[PDB]
Symmetry: C4
Subunit: 464 residues, 4 copies
């Protein structure tokens, strides 16, 4: 029958199609070209992003050394002030170093007029302290008369062209935070020399003296925001080429999916009517090609990411996160799709089919063990949280347990529990039981069962 | 027979019971609701405890920076004095910083009159040194005339309202320890702003200069004890709801267990008399439902923990350890009990039954390997203890070996043995043999046998 | 026949022997008692050794802080002098701190007259510098006129009762090392208070300024040797009890081995003569009991270790290493021997026999993989040795590779190779190939084959 | 037939050949001797290289402490200057320490006249700064008038026999780097005393103040190049012996390969003509001996490495990398070739054949998983690169992922992602999904499938 022959044309391997009709498999070549071009585009994007990130990080480190009093490398998380004098000296040192920046900095930084932020009236530096509107606190008499309104008092500082901030008085009893805003603009000379494209950076520096905890310890932070700007192509052409290749692949895959859907409809209308027997939904799902779904998803992701990258490279978006995520996911998807080419040979198809037939039982076992994992996570978070640095937050607990079951950072956890004793022998004994039981169970039973499932699936595939 | 039909009603799946009698499985819904409510209660308790712990830790760090002379972060375990001058300066610095606390601290701390402890006569700070009653020690002449009575000499220090301690003279040759007791009370402003509940903390600060070792090195420690106190609801209602749900679940499960016991009694009295044949204890154990035992245990633990949490949240107990342990264990138990729902489908029941039938042989192999593990622990503790930081105590030895068999911190152990050489080539050679033999055996035979046991159990389950 | 019945009495389980003759298995009870007593003795010995080691280590740390100029904790391996002034100040600081020790030390240390060592003429401190007899070295003119004779010039320093060393002049161009010898004696007050046994320690302190490398960097070390001495029982009785129990067990096991040998001789003389057929050596080996060999070995080791421990506890040997090794090995052996009791039940015997029948093929595979492991060790040592801290010595290379195959410290090795680049791209590429190939092979083939061997042995045992 | 008998002589085991013809297997003894001699030569070479490397490293550390202002151990990667004053003080300190080296150094270092490098006119020290020809940069006005020509301005410094550099003025706005070149020569006294061979080292010291990044932070580096020179045997004889043994082994193996090729040619010309049937290429490959190929490769590598080592030991090449690589590869190859001896016994041949028959499917599975691994590498590099220190470069990403799949440095990666939050919740969520999916897949499916493949191959070998 015509339907039988047309269905036989479907599901044949590309080699069989070439034997039957002598049509060159140009779709396969197109997909290979797509893999190559998307990988090249991702590599170039990554190299440029690496350069930009390195420049930003080095400038931020230089700013930290320039403006933070007594700063040392590797102490960002513990850098804090503990006395009123320390806070005053830190703030004054930051402002003073700002005021004499041209004659001390190794980098060519230029002041930005009006860069003090929204709280500045055109001054380059803004020194703002925020405190509660009314903050009469009396721990001795147990008085908490508090007005939750926040009051922002700012001091405007301007650099000399070509000292009222010294009279700053803090409100420690009701202080919330102290912030310093200013902007510095410079030129990336490596970009000037190498790629001849003049990139002029603008760093927005924010120094925070955070007292939101009101715990007597005020951490000190320095953060930067960068605005790239051209200051008075092969990449764009390659991006256009990538977009065109992805669009062509998407069109071909969509047409193939439509043809498969039409063939499925013809088969079902023939079988339900001429033969009378009703067919199931699995017979419908057999007609779809999951590889084509993967390909169209990768094409859509690549097209969106390439549009975003074109916008970014023209200094218009500066939103690298979403574009990078899209491009990386698309590249991963195409490199996974290479498995379809690998599946056309039975020797590789044995292993691929072993994985495919093992997947359902593996997922079921994952569902079975997820509840035990979650119970252990909750118990560890609630009990060992106050006493263990690795159990402070639920995500941290999950990461610690996942590392434990894979044999990483075990003795560190045990020694952390041992050194402080947990401030209670009962807590220490519970931690011993908890860790030993969890590691023993998840390593010597769950992993072994995963291995057993995979081995059984391989045995079934090898001996049908 | 009536007994046969009633026993057939027992052991049927919930779906079969619904088919037979059309009774909605409301016990299952009750257990799901119980899981949800206990998880929510545990999450809320954990968040509040996290806030309290963070506040306490930050205040303790601030106190360490304020009162410990030359203190630096990350040096608590090595912070010590080595000369008489160092000890004198440390003590005097602590007291002096206490006396000028209001004008230097970033936190609003208030003095506590009469907070010097039992050894104070109403003074805020107590500076006590403890020494032996008679301590004439002559290492040159080998004289050890010692009276083991301890003498406590205290100095009372009071802060100014709105210097005799400078004449302190120590008895180094017979000194036991020097301690400083005082209390500071403050207000948690985050609690004031966010949850509007005024919490007034009271920190009991104890600085210890410990000379109990009499080894010429005196470690210096700072410890704090916190007493939370309200200073002049949804949580309680949710706790009551959790208690009621757990009580209802406990009642239903106990009634089901009683019905099962009655059915077992009827079956045994029918079989032993009418049929004459004596039945075994395993036939008795078959009639019990282990899931119901787990559920009633979790209910009891949750009820006790919720009562303790209600007491704690009213500022009456301040004993978080036991309540947290009970709540975490109950949450873990219910999340494990979810496996009973998972067992009603044969696809998941295959894996669950594989684990169940593998458990006995796994336990037997654990018994077999425990003696070898203990022998290795004892040998390592006795030999490598004097030369390895990881082998100082038996629990430390067990943790190190358990980490070793799971492939963690191996090269660190080897390098620790190598760097010092063990001060003997014989000890180094023994350590090489010990570590290599232990790791090789336990990784390449014991773990492989665990995998083999699990695989065999899975093979038996898959092919009955 | 009589021989058949007597041989049948041999090899029966203890339960079968009890059934046959009604003889209480008192040898088993004796061995259990032996296990208990040796474990208790080892635990007590370990606790006492822990106390002694802690005291010695704390005193050594105090000495390092007292006598080493600018010393900081955790910098022993890098503590060195780099200029002539630094060396002079270090030596002078050490001697000056020695001369004013009583008025600065927190520990009660007494001077030891005549403790300066062999190079002192009765003075308490000896300051000796060693240099070549003739050391005219001219790097500019390439002159190496050297007399390898070493000349020791000493300066005698005596503490005041109840400054010529300042004129010390070094010979840097030919200097070998500078050493400082003195002794301090003290009293362990914890021993005085707790166990009432007066222990008077004598520390031999040696400070070394080593210039044997002649590399312009002189490391500085402080080492101590301790001589314990009583200064003007249950333990001994328990040691005697342990010795008696071990001797009785040794006698019984030797008698049993002799009886087995006699039975083997009777069987062989009957079979070779009456039956004519010649029997093999495996039939001889079947008659021996390996558990009895283990027991007699453990008894001999325990007896030797207990004699040494008795000698040590009387302050006569001070050689803890050999005694500790003997005692630990004996304890490990008896805890392993518990497996014989475990073997009397078939459920545990299944696993034990699985291990026993897997052992030969496991050993053969170990022989197969040892040559590859050794080749990789040699290649890594010769190539990556100059560029990797983990490949400096052959034992270090072996430890690093053994940790690598067990999934420990992998990224650390990779990052160490990456950070310095190996000072050559060829070396970096070779390191990449070397590490990837080694880890891949040994993890994904060798370990899998070990698992396969164990699984096959278990399959053979389970299905005979 | 004659051909059948001659082919039967081929492929027989050495024991069978000895039985047939009584010829002593002297080739096997020659190969054993070769293994021994190459291992001994490699060990001696490694020991000498260890001594040289240790001397060079110690001298470099001494130079770093002598010439780098404020240098501390373990801070090479972060050592940098951040102000103009800091750079000036660092440069001046380096030059000043050079000028007074004889009276401060602990090592006997001699000045080298004319050692300032190509940029020196015979002076011992060269202080050169490099800057752009025209470097008018105006970040405020966005001006980048740049002439990419580099201008090198040098200052010549000469040590006193038996201060114009103080007037050095830098061009920070256009500075590229500042370098200091000088040479110091010394004598290795350990070589003088121990092996009596006078080795006179010449260190070329280069201090770099790198401003190529133009980021306001100037890293400071010290690098040394060493030229060994004899200054006014058993090793050579052993090298000659090794060369002769390798040449003899190569000749014998080549002759055996030629004989095998001739036998293959005779067999093919007989079978294709007399029998008519055409044979395949696998029948040709069966006649070759892979062990002989391994042996000749190892012989060639050893001969080349020994020639290079002979050249090096005469102070003529100083290129240790290539020689070490060749020697290590040859030693690894011969230690692998020991497996051929192991293959002559069927008990070991079982395991060896298991590995051999598992190799093809293992390679196919590696090809299958390589594409997924590469996709994950690309995605991680592009996304987590800006936010993770472990994902900066593609090789670093590959090393991190390879360590992750083997259960190493997992929690460190998770905590690195957690601590900074990735500066975006979307990036953090993506990192969670990425890491969890990658680790789960590669550990619980890929490794299990490798184990299953090995187990299946072992099952096929065990039960033919
Ligand atoms: C759970 C489902 C089935 C899983 C099956 C897999 C089991 C593992 C498989 C093979 C065995 C591999 C190794 C097992 C290691 C077990 C170690 C147990 C603890 C040994 C303690 C010795 C030190 C000592 O004896 N410790 C004692 C002496 O102390 P110390 O002298 O060292 O002083 C320390 C001081 N300090 C203040 C207390 C810190 C100490 O006082 C007791 C501690 C209690 C230990 C808790 C035991 C919890 C074990 C339960 C685990 C269940 C799972 C089974 C595991 C076999
Ligand atoms: C035990 C039950 C059965 C278990 C079966 C599983 C076995 C493992 C499976 C597969 C093999 C995987 C790798 C095996 C690694 C074995 C390494 C052995 C030691 C190699 C030493 C090389 C360095 C050197 O040759 N080291 C020598 C040269 O020193 P150096 O030049 O490096 O200088 C160092 C200086 N220092 C002062 C000594 C520190 C050194 O002098 C000797 C050391 C003795 C080494 C002890 C050997 C103990 C091994 C017994 C283990 C038994 C279990 C079987 C293991 C196969
Ligand atoms: C060997 C017997 C059989 C064993 C069978 C088991 C095999 C493993 C099983 C499953 C697969 C699991 C993961 C495999 C990971 C393989 C990674 C290969 C290297 C990838 C490099 C990407 C980074 C890059 O592409 N790196 C390139 C780009 O550099 P970059 O941009 O990162 O810059 C770095 C700068 N620097 C100065 C060079 C440091 C770099 O230039 C090339 C490096 C060469 C990499 C060496 C490859 C050696 C692999 C041989 C191993 C053989 C064994 C088989 C393994 C499959």
């Amino acid at each position: 029958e015509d339907l039988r022959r047309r269905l036989k044309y479907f599901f044949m391997s590309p080699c069989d199609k070439f034997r039957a009709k002598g049509r060159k498999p140009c779709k396969l070549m197109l997909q290979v070209v797509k893999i190559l071009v998307v990988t090249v585009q991702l590599i170039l994007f990554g190299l440029s992003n690496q350069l930009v990130v390195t420049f930003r990080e080095e400038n931020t480190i230089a700013f930290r050394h320039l403006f933070l009093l007594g700063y040392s490398d590797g102490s960002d998380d513990t850098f804090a002030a503990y006395t009123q004098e320390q806070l005053y000296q830190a703030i004054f040192y930051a402002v003073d170093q700002y005021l004499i920046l041209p004659e001390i900095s190794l980098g060519r930084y230029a002041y930005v007029r009006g860069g003090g932020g929204p709280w500045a009236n055109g001054s380059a530096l803004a020194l703002c302290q925020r405190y509660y509107h009314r903050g009469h606190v009396d721990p001795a008499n147990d008085t908490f008369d508090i007005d939750p309104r926040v009051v922002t008092d700012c001091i405007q500082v301007d650099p000399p062209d070509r000292a009222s901030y010294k009279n700053l008085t803090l409100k420690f009893h009701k202080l919330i935070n102290v912030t310093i805003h200013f902007q510095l603009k410079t030129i990336n000379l490596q970009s000037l020399i190498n790629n001849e494209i003049p990139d002029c950076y603008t760093f927005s520096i924010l120094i925070t003296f955070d007292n939101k905890a009101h715990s007597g310890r005020i951490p000190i932070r320095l953060e930067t925001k960068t605005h790239i700007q051209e200051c008075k192509s092969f990449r764009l052409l390659f991006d256009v080429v990538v977009i065109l290749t992805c669009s062509l692949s998407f069109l071909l895959c969509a047409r193939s999916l439509l043809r498969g859907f039409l063939l499925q409809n013809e088969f079902v209308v023939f079988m339900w009517r001429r033969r009378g027997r009703e067919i199931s939904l699995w017979e419908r799902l057999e007609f779809v090609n999951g590889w084509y779904i993967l390909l169209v998803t990768s094409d859509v992701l690549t097209i969106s990411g390439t549009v975003m990258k074109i916008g970014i490279e023209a200094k218009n978006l500066a939103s690298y996160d979403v574009c990078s995520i899209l491009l990386g996911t698309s590249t991963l998807l195409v490199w996974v799709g290479v498995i379809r080419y690998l599946t056309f040979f039975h020797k590789y198809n044995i292993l691929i089919a072993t994985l495919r037939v093992a997947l359902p039982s593996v997922m079921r076992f994952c569902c079975c063990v997820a509840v035990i994992y979650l119970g252990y996570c909750f118990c560890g978070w609630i009990v060992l949280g106050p006493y263990h640095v690795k159990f402070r937050s639920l995500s941290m607990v999950s990461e610690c347990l996942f590392s434990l079951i894979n044999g990483d950072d075990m003795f560190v956890t045990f020694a952390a529990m041992q050194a402080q004793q947990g401030h209670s022998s009962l807590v220490w004994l519970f931690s011993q039981l908890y860790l030993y039981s969890f590691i023993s169970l998840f390593i010597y039973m769950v992993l072994s069962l995963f291995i057993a499932l995979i081995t059984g699936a391989y045995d079934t595939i090898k001996h049908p």
